[PDB]
Amino acid sequence: METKEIFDAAPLSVSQFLSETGQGLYIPPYQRAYSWELPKIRRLLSDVAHGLDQLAEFEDSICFLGTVIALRDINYTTVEPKYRSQVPSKVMTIIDGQQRMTTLLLLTTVLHEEIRVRAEKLTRDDEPSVWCYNQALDVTGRLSNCFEEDMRYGEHRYYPRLIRSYYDVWSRNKGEARYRSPIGYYLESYVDLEAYRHLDRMRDQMRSMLRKAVGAGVKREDDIQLPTGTDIGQSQNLQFALFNSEFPPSVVEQLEDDAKMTPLTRLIVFANYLLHRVTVAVVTAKREDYGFDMFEALNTTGQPLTAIETFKPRAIKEEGLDEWQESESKLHFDVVEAYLDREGADKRQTVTSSVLLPFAMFQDGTKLTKRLNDQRRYLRTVFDKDPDIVARRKVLAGLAQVARFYEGPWGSPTKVPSCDDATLRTQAGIALAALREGGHDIVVGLLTRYFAAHRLSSPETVESSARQFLLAARSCAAFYALWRGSFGSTAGIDGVYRSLMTHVVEALQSYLKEQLRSEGIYDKQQWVARAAMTPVYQHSKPLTRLLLLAASQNSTP
Amino acid sequence: METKEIFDAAPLSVSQFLSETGQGLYIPPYQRAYSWELPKIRRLLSDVAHGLDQLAEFEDSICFLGTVIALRDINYTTVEPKYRSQVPSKVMTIIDGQQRMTTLLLLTTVLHEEIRVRAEKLTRDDEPSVWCYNQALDVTGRLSNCFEEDMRYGEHRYYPRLIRSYYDVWSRNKGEARYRSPIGYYLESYVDLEAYRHLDRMRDQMRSMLRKAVGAGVKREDDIQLPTGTDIGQSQNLQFALFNSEFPPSVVEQLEDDAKMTPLTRLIVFANYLLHRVTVAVVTAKREDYGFDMFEALNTTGQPLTAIETFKPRAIKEEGLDEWQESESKLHFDVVEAYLDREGADKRQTVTSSVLLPFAMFQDGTKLTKRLNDQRRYLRTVFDKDPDIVARRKVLAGLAQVARFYEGPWGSPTKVPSCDDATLRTQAGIALAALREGGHDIVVGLLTRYFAAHRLSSPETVESSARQFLLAARSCAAFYALWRGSFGSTAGIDGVYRSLMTHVVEEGEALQSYLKEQLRSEGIYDKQQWVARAAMTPVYQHSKPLTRLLLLAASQNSTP
Amino acid sequence: METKEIFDAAPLSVSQFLSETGQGLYIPPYQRAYSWELPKIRRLLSDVAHGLDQLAEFEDSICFLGTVIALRDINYTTVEPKYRSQVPSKVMTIIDGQQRMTTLLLLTTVLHEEIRVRAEKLTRDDEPSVWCYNQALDVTGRLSNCFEEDMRYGEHRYYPRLIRSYYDVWSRNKGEARYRSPIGYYLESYVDLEAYRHLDRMRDQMRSMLRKAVGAGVKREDDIQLPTGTDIGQSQNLQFALFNSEFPPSVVEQLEDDAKMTPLTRLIVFANYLLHRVTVAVVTAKREDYGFDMFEALNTTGQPLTAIETFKPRAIKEEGLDEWQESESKLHFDVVEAYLDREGADKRQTVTSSVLLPFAMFQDGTKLTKRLNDQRRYLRTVFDKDPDIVARRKVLAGLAQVARFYEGPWGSPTKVPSCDDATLRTQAGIALAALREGGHDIVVGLLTRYFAAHRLSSPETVESSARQFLLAARSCAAFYALWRGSFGSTAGIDGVYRSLMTHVVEEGEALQSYLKEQLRSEGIYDKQQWVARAAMTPVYQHSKPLTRLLLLAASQNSTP
Numbered sequence A: 001m002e003t004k005e006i007f008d009a010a011p012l013s014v015s016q017f018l019s020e021t022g023q024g025l026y027i028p029p030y031q032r033a034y035s036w037e038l039p040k041i042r043r044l045l046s047d048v049a050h051g052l053d054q055l056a057e058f059e060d061s062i063c064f065l066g067t068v069i070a071l072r073d074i075n076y077t078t079v080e081p082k083y084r085s086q087v088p089s090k091v092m093t094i095i096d097g098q099q100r101m102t103t104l105l106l107l108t109t110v111l112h113e114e115i116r117v118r119a120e121k122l123t124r125d126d127e128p129s130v131w132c133y134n135q136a137l138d139v140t141g142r143l144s145n146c147f148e149e150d151m152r153y154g155e156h157r158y159y160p161r162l163i164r165s166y167y168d169v170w171s172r173n174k175g176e177a178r179y180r181s182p183i184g185y186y187l188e189s190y191v192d193l194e195a196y197r198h199l200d201r202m203r204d205q206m207r208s209m210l211r212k213a214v215g216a217g218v219k220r221e222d223d224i225q226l227p228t229g230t231d232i233g234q235s236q237n238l239q240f241a242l243f244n245s246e247f248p249p250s251v252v253e254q255l256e257d258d259a260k261m262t263p264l265t266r267l268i269v270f271a272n273y274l275l276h277r278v279t280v281a282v283v284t285a286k287r288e289d290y291g292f293d294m295f296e297a298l299n300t301t302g303q304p305l306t307a308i309e310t311f312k313p314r315a316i317k318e319e320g321l322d323e324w325q326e327s328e329s330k331l332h333f334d335v336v337e338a339y340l341d342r343e344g345a346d347k348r349q350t351v352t353s354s355v356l357l358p359f360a361m362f363q364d365g366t367k368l369t370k371r372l373n374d375q376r377r378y379l380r381t382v383f384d385k386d387p388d389i390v391a392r393r394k395v396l397a398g399l400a401q402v403a404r405f406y407e408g409p410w411g412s413p414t415k416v417p418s419c420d421d422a423t424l425r426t427q428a429g430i431a432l433a434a435l436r437e438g439g440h441d442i443v444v445g446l447l448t449r450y451f452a453a454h455r456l457s458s459p460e461t462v463e464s465s466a467r468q469f470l471l472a473a474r475s476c477a478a479f480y481a482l483w484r485g486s487f488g489s490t491a492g493i494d495g496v497y498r499s500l501m502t503h504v505v506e507a508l509q510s511y512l513k514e515q516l517r518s519e520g521i522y523d524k525q526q527w528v529a530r531a532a533m534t535p536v537y538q539h540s541k542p543l544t545r546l547l548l549l550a551a552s553q554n555s556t557p
Numbered sequence B, C: 001m002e003t004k005e006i007f008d009a010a011p012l013s014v015s016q017f018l019s020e021t022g023q024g025l026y027i028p029p030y031q032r033a034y035s036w037e038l039p040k041i042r043r044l045l046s047d048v049a050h051g052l053d054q055l056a057e058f059e060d061s062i063c064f065l066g067t068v069i070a071l072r073d074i075n076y077t078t079v080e081p082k083y084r085s086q087v088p089s090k091v092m093t094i095i096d097g098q099q100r101m102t103t104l105l106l107l108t109t110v111l112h113e114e115i116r117v118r119a120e121k122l123t124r125d126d127e128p129s130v131w132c133y134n135q136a137l138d139v140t141g142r143l144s145n146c147f148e149e150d151m152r153y154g155e156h157r158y159y160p161r162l163i164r165s166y167y168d169v170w171s172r173n174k175g176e177a178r179y180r181s182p183i184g185y186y187l188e189s190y191v192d193l194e195a196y197r198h199l200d201r202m203r204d205q206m207r208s209m210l211r212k213a214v215g216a217g218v219k220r221e222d223d224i225q226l227p228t229g230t231d232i233g234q235s236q237n238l239q240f241a242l243f244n245s246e247f248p249p250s251v252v253e254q255l256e257d258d259a260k261m262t263p264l265t266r267l268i269v270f271a272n273y274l275l276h277r278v279t280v281a282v283v284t285a286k287r288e289d290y291g292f293d294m295f296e297a298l299n300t301t302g303q304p305l306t307a308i309e310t311f312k313p314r315a316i317k318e319e320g321l322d323e324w325q326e327s328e329s330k331l332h333f334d335v336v337e338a339y340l341d342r343e344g345a346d347k348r349q350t351v352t353s354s355v356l357l358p359f360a361m362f363q364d365g366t367k368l369t370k371r372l373n374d375q376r377r378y379l380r381t382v383f384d385k386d387p388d389i390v391a392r393r394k395v396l397a398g399l400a401q402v403a404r405f406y407e408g409p410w411g412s413p414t415k416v417p418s419c420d421d422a423t424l425r426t427q428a429g430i431a432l433a434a435l436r437e438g439g440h441d442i443v444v445g446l447l448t449r450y451f452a453a454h455r456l457s458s459p460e461t462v463e464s465s466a467r468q469f470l471l472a473a474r475s476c477a478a479f480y481a482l483w484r485g486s487f488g489s490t491a492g493i494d495g496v497y498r499s500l501m502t503h504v505v506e507e508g509e510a511l512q513s514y515l516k517e518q519l520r521s522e523g524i525y526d527k528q529q530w531v532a533r534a535a536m537t538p539v540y541q542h543s544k545p546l547t548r549l550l551l552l553a554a555s556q557n558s559t560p
Helices: A014-018 A038-055 A098-120 A130-147 A166-179 A193-212 A236-243 A249-256 A261-277 A288-299 A307-316 A327-341 A346-362 A372-383 A390-406 A422-437 A442-447 A450-454 A462-485 A492-502 A506-518 A525-532 A540-555 B014-018 B038-055 B098-120 B130-147 B166-179 B193-212 B236-243 B249-256 B262-277 B288-299 B307-315 B327-341 B346-362 B372-383 B390-407 B422-435 B442-455 B463-487 B492-499 B510-523 B528-536 B543-558 C014-018 C038-055 C098-120 C130-147 C166-179 C193-212 C236-243 C249-256 C262-277 C288-299 C307-316 C327-341 C346-362 C372-383 C390-406 C422-437 C443-455 C463-485 C492-499 C510-523 C528-536 C543-553
Strands: A009-013 A023-026 A063-073 A090-096 A278-285 B009-013 B023-026 B063-073 B090-094 B278-285 C009-013 C023-026 C063-072 C090-094 C278-285
Touching: A009 A014, A009 A261, A014 A098, A014 A130, A014 A261, A014 A278, A038 A063, A038 A098, A038 A193, A038 A236, A038 A261, A038 A372, A063 A098, A063 A288, A090 A098, A090 A288, A098 A130, A098 A166, A098 A193, A098 A261, A130 A166, A130 A249, A130 A261, A166 A193, A236 A261, A249 A261, A261 A278, A278 A288, A307 A327, A307 A346, A307 A372, A307 A390, A327 A346, A327 A390, A346 A372, A346 A390, A346 A442, A346 A492, A372 A390, A390 A442, A390 A450, A422 A442, A422 A462, A422 A540, A442 A462, A442 A492, A450 A462, A462 A492, A462 A506, A462 A525, A462 A540, A492 A506, B009 B014, B009 B262, B009 C009, B014 B098, B014 B130, B014 B262, B014 B278, B038 B063, B038 B098, B038 B193, B038 B236, B038 B262, B038 B372, B063 B098, B063 B288, B063 C288, B098 B130, B098 B166, B098 B193, B098 B262, B130 B166, B130 B262, B166 B193, B236 B262, B262 B278, B278 B288, B278 C288, B288 C063, B288 C278, B288 C372, B307 B327, B307 B346, B307 B372, B307 B390, B327 B346, B327 B390, B346 B372, B346 B390, B346 B442, B372 B390, B372 C288, B390 B442, B422 B442, B422 B463, B422 B543, B442 B463, B442 B492, B463 B492, B463 B510, B463 B528, B463 B543, C009 C014, C009 C262, C014 C098, C014 C130, C014 C262, C014 C278, C038 C063, C038 C098, C038 C193, C038 C236, C038 C262, C063 C098, C063 C288, C098 C130, C098 C166, C098 C193, C098 C262, C130 C166, C130 C262, C166 C193, C236 C262, C262 C278, C278 C288, C307 C327, C307 C346, C307 C372, C307 C390, C327 C346, C327 C390, C346 C372, C346 C390, C346 C443, C372 C390, C390 C443, C422 C443, C422 C463, C422 C543, C443 C463, C463 C492, C463 C510, C463 C543
Parallel strands: A023 A090, A063 A278, B023 B090, B063 B278, C023 C090, C063 C278
Antiparallel strands: A009 A278, A063 A090, B009 B278, B063 B090, C009 C278, C063 C090
């Protein structure tokens, strides 16, 4: 009867799936122990963060924690200890996604207690802040709806039939932590014990990553960016989407001050964006062998489409159409060429991410990120910000980031003006050679205005730009040598390079030196001192840069 | 896109529909006030009782409280006072079915409070009876999941915005009665105020309707047939269906003792059969004018087909097949004739029930009852109890009850043998004219089987004998009827009539006289006593019986 | 598992339900013979016409031919002659809706043949009108997709397996009309022979019906409202919704010229609206007894709500809000009372439609029509036509139509002024008694507006002027009624009275007499002629009109 069970696929928010009134999710006897890796959880948390984030301006935009294949066991022929009296009504045996799910439940754990204990630090009563107290109470109860249920009496299932897995006992223990009134202080959890070790650690680390995103520190290389109170309140769309109703005006302005609740409310905002706007795909097969054949049917489908391949059509079908071997077609020819050369399947994705992320800075300096979502949407927003005249420029600017990839960065470094005070060329080539070796990669986007030098009013004012570019390359490598070379590490450089693009030749030397003065690093002595106690074993490249910078000099003294 | 919203229909149990964790059922302003009438609530509780009842033997059979049309109001454009911060997420503005809904909501109420306080008189801890305390706890929670939800804090939806309708105030007030710890004592409630009066009354009357079916008194004319502990424990099907798992053997035997827990556990079985095995159909249109046009489209469709009309297909398709102008075709021709005659539209259902209810006695005396389910299933069980020689007989027996319907009961009273000691004929004609006027109606089935054996007698060979035994049965039946009527009431006479067609034995006319007298004595007879009860009666029970007794004291003095 | 099969309900257009490449629809042995009656078939055709009509302006608005309950007979345990080799794969056994279905199928037939032979009469080739041939061709193909399917070869199912039910032979024979190219002439068809006769009739009377709506004659009392080419081509919504594409500009103007291809296209447009925008709802039970229990569950749901009952909410919640025991509340009080009295359930809708249709004339006189859609929407458009001050006036006009229902019209006729030249009161009372006996019911609105402004007149200051003008109005109204009835029959009069409530002008009592006489001329007046037409009449058209005319010659002889 083919339209038969076989499949049954349904989209569910996390709370539709996890807070069902009868259901129980069951890890089968053949699935292994937890075994997810802190980068993969970082990725998952940052992806739901992307959902929360993109929600404020694109009213739709739904996140997607993948799919799970489950087997609707009616006859409880799966449940490990039978004890048929009190098995739940709906038992879902998770085939695939058993690792995903386990982080997700644990996420509610951190999101419960944090949101809970920050609500115990709440001011009891003062103003629209008890507003925050109820908005907490609501989400906390609604997450306790995700861990567990009530049922009859005693210990949650008869009187001696218990829960001992890593995820299982872990969840039983957070249940206990929440149940216990008394006072709301922070919690602390307690075959191969490596299982339990990894699970408890990853749980406590999710609690850490979230306790991280709550009071300033900055990170980028990790950390996930909850929109903050200062900008949660200027977006009606987030208000309504997450709380079905606009916030008290009497609350957005104590949010504007970044008050004691703006950490807690941020957690809360994330929690509701987690609980109602991120969706898992569930396929419930009702015969497990169909589950397996369907597991294969799900693992062998995809190839991939590059963000450039996914938007080319929207150029090819924007201003140019059919009779479209046109101007923007030349600008595209360039980038399709570069990608065809510097790649060939996952190589295609990493390369094109290499081109879209500096182009990001190149336009109004937004920090693009890998995710095919953000790439599709950034290219489309930028392009479609105007009419069929700036469209041309946006596309040519991708092509130009490409041209820059071919000249200076890698390639063979030589090229710029070749003769324009030739000492200057032979030395700024070192900037282009070294900056292509460590944390300076935004330097690539800012320097991508020898693109301005290539796109010039020709001979009229060509050499002036051919010179400006060398100058920027140098000053790039120099401020680099300082910041990275001088004490600390990167992330800094990266942010400040971002804003010396949006927040505004000699102009960049002045601002970059200005930022150096800001970092308490402008004034001889100090910097040399700070530099002395760095490491170099930070960047082998930086080490050699500095050694050559004290050495090569003594060829004129 | 026509496949669009328009409809979107789904079957849901009571708990699937009422206890959604986000949902709110909202009656639009144009709907009228509650205004259901106690007969209709009797009908609904009795029908869920029929479902529970027929559950123990038919593992399937699901009850069916009609359908409701609703509107998935997303923009809350329906809600009377807005106050949008704390409106629920899913608001289901009920188009049709607003009254069923109220009775059903109220039902959870009675079943909550009763199930609750009976569990407070529970024995705390002794045995498999704390099984009863836990099963109570479970159903209590699952029914409170039908009234209300938790939401933020304060009084359950902001702080100065309240719920004041007739159905609304009822539910807010029972919510309070349930929430308040203290101790578990029985409850007591508190435009036109007649509205509120009727609703509050109906609710307490469902409580009086269920608390009745729990300690002995008997009714038939009312009170619903909740299966009893003495027969709830011998059906695994009910055990598993309502509780997912077979009862502790250590409890079915304190159930067999009809112990103190047995009303409460019976109630619990009833509540679970309601909350999980009766299902309502929901149609959610997503544009209210579509809701209206659908309301109309659903309102004008059905006719109905009589249980005989639905069974011919299974007779004409048993032994006879297409090549079916056969014997059972003749026996059914008889019944089809009578029903085409004695009817033409709801008259059809009333008539075919008149024919089916005595025949059920005619076979091995099961008591048929109006419901098209039970009629369909009895006819098929009776029919498919053997093979194609007895089937013919089953069908012929229906035909013969029909023939009876034409001879005696109604008809013209006259006929029996016409000449076989004509005094006895002119007398038994009176028994036949009388019994068709009051509670003596199972007697119709018995006289149908006796003169059935007379019309179908060994003609000539043994015919006159049956022609006489029939009129003898008729006289003896009107007499036992007069005795049991001057007792006090019917009901008992019908059950005695019912087992004297099942409770006999003597290997494979006088028998009936002897057995009827034996029952009359198991009651009270012996001249004197009987006469006493006669003075005790009323005459204002059945006008027919009064006129009969007057003639039986009068006509006698034409020989003395 | 309660969520189980049980239901499965889905909305499907005529062509999604009927033209599945796998489905075969089967009427079980217990369903009766066809037995629908021409009124119900008209009503259904008029309702799909009403959907067509409302499509052109309300782009969404979908038609709705009710529901059908079916049994997904997978194992073929229902199908009478088996022959399993070739039974279709998907069989739906129709529990309820078998007559709907049967008319609808035959309709595809009538719509097939008409569109077909009318498309063979086309001009071969001249213009976008070969457009007409192509749009016909598409419609004809998709409608035969509803009668039948292909499969292998020979007589459409092996070689000795043939089809003899009434619908069956009918649809097999119409199929044959379609397959045999040969030549394109109109068709001619050929248990109890009544069954077959009635069905063959109903279909030729369907061809007769839809066959009318294409060339002039008019009927109203029957006939249906197919949109006209002159207004089919000006509706891009109809263009797009029914053909996915806007007509040739090059075709809409030979459509506006009302040319030869304007009947065929109107038919085509009707067929495509049938095939794509009317939707039936199907409930697929997969166990026949579930279908039965639910047949009941659907037949026992609805009451009904009158259009005034549904508009009340938008009155009580417009300007007046909660704080609303106000002015408009009394104006409604009046009408809610009037309907609550002259009724108590189908009486309610007949009564409230009786009030709304003349109220429709009292305001800007639009011709309302029974249909609860059009009734709700008229009330809502009228009321919400402005702001919170004239709305009051609309509601009061409803109340006043009620008041007139109580004063003059029926009641006891007496009421007007009682004394204001009392000859005129006792005389116009006859107008009020007589005109309330036959087709003069549109007059009801005019007399209701005259004595409405009389009861709502400048008290004393100009009251008696209004109170006399009202009796004058009744007198003049019964006069125009008598003249036009002695012409031949109504309808005409109804249209003229109608336009005399809209077709006027003179800045913002005698006027009505003047306009009624001016129309009487527009037809024919001037003594002699009228007298002639008098002899022409019937009186046996309206017994009431006969008596009025008899009194109009007799009583006169009491002064001469």
